């Protein structure tokens, strides 16, 4: 019982999805399947063979080798990272909860409500909530009065997040006025948000610290920056989600702690996350 069903989600540079050789998965890529629908009037669809790489994919390769398991990697199609709807989990969290996956590998934020339904590994990427602005925008951080009391300003500060993830959940829990205000500025994804920040349609973009630090490091002309020295509110980490009571957790934690000690994590950070800016 060594061959494991593993779920992932694309989010550069953590998980990058590519098309297969027009015949298999070359280089540092691993095979990952994605279930694609024939149409929207059916449940019928087909698995499309893709290729996966990135920081989290390298961690999965090291774990597979160290912990001695083989796997069938697939991309989640029902939601993204994980959202609880009327006590029903979707995304990568849902796949683990409903036992369609042994583990979820990716840019998956550890938080209290997810920890109630899945077991998380020790953290292996430092993250939390950061604020991206165009260089020169004056905000102290998430607790600035421009965020906390937006209508005290003329015109009010325009800021949003990509909903349904750990960032929105945290803001909903901590800052009720800010949350109900932000919803008109919900962004479909990170690429749309960055373009809204550049087209002057958004003043600030609040999201996962690790992904924003990466995007700031590669921004063309280094126009978009994270506030402070890349300050992190609600500090947390990415972790591997495993089913509660999983026999795999002990060895995965021990292997991740071994990787940090040997400087193997620092190498992955150099290879995938560092940038020009």
């Amino acid at each position: 019982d060594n061959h494991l069903s593993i779920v992932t989600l694309e989010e550069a540079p953590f998980v990058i999805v590519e098309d297969i050789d027009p015949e298999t998965c070359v280089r540092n890529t691993v095979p990952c399947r994605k279930f694609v629908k024939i149409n929207n009037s059916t449940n019928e669809g087909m698995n499309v063979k893709k290729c996966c790489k990135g920081f989290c994919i390298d961690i999965l390769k090291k774990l597979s080798r160290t912990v001695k398991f083989t796997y069938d990697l697939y991309l989640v199609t029902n939601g993204k990272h994980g959202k609880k709807v009327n006590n029903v989990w979707n995304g990568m969290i849902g796949e683990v909860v409903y036992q369609r996956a042994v583990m979820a590998v990716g840019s998956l934020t550890i938080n209290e409500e997810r920890s109630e339904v899945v077991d998380f590994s020790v953290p292996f990427v430092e993250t939390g909530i950061s604020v991206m602005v165009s260089r020169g925008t004056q905000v102290t951080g998430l607790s600035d009065k421009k965020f906390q009391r937006p209508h005290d300003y003329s015109p009010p500060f325009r800021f949003g997040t990509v909903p349904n993830g750990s960032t929105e959940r945290n803001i909903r829990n901590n800052y009720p006025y800010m949350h109900q205000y932000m919803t008109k500025f919900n962004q479909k994804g990170v690429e749309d948000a960055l373009v809204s920040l550049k087209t002057g349609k958004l003043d600030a973009f609040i999201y996962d610290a690790a992904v924003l630090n990466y995007k700031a490091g590669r921004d063309e002309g280094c126009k978009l920056v994270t506030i402070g020295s890349g300050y992190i509110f609600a500090t947390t980490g990415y972790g591997i989600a495993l089913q509660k009571g999983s026999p795999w957790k002990r060895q995965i934690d021990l292997a991740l702690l071994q990787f940090v000690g040997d400087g193997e994590m620092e190498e992955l950070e150099t290879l995938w996350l560092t940038g020009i800016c």
Binding site: I110, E112, S115, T236, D253, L254, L257, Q258, V260, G261
Partner: protein, 282 residues
Amino acid sequence: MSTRLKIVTIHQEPFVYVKPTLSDGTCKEEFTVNGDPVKKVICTGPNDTSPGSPRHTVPQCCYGFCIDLLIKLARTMNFTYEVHLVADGKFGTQERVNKKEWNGMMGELLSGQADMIVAPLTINNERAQYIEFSKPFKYQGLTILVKKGTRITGINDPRLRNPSDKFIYATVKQSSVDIYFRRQVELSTMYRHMEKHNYESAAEAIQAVRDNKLHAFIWDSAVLEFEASQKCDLVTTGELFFRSGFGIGMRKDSPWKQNVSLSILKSHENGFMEDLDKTWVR
């Protein structure tokens, strides 16, 4: 009859301050700059800190980041407790006796002398094989403390990588830093120098840097930076290496482990941990 959890901690400012009680046996009522009262606990511990010497246990006063964290954990989870300082004054390493033994707070937790470790205890592979660590309450790293005037690039400075009896450096004996410099083959040269000068405590070592007895002290950034900001005659040098977290330590069969990590995650998410960080560290 006591079903109270036995908590082991260690003297380590700004996480754990240790002070004498007043003559009535109570703790001096003190306040923060925020005007709030400093929460304090009675913590029993040896008076004679010297090694290979008799340990006379006396009630003392404990406070700080880790005590505030314990109070919140006990409040949240509804457990009763009693605090004591580790009898041998160490964090904990596994040493060869054929048999191997854990010392420090690690040894106390494994023997049953303690039910939980609440201290700035580094989460590492060696310890995680024997105990359960909570999700981290703090993420930090290793840095170097020197007397002001000394110039060092960091860990990769020729004065560290090529040791001599001219420049003396060390860390704390039987600690996670001791473990790290011993495990890593690339740090063997560095370890061979250190094993001759390593101190019994971080406080003994920080004092020896001030007294020009020790030239460089390699330790946790969360402790060193606090010390550097308080004592301006000492400065932290170089960039951070060996990043690691601090966690609550429990035995693998503890019924509290899931709720200890859930409480730590709740505290990071609602700003409580950042409040502790503002009160004690920054």
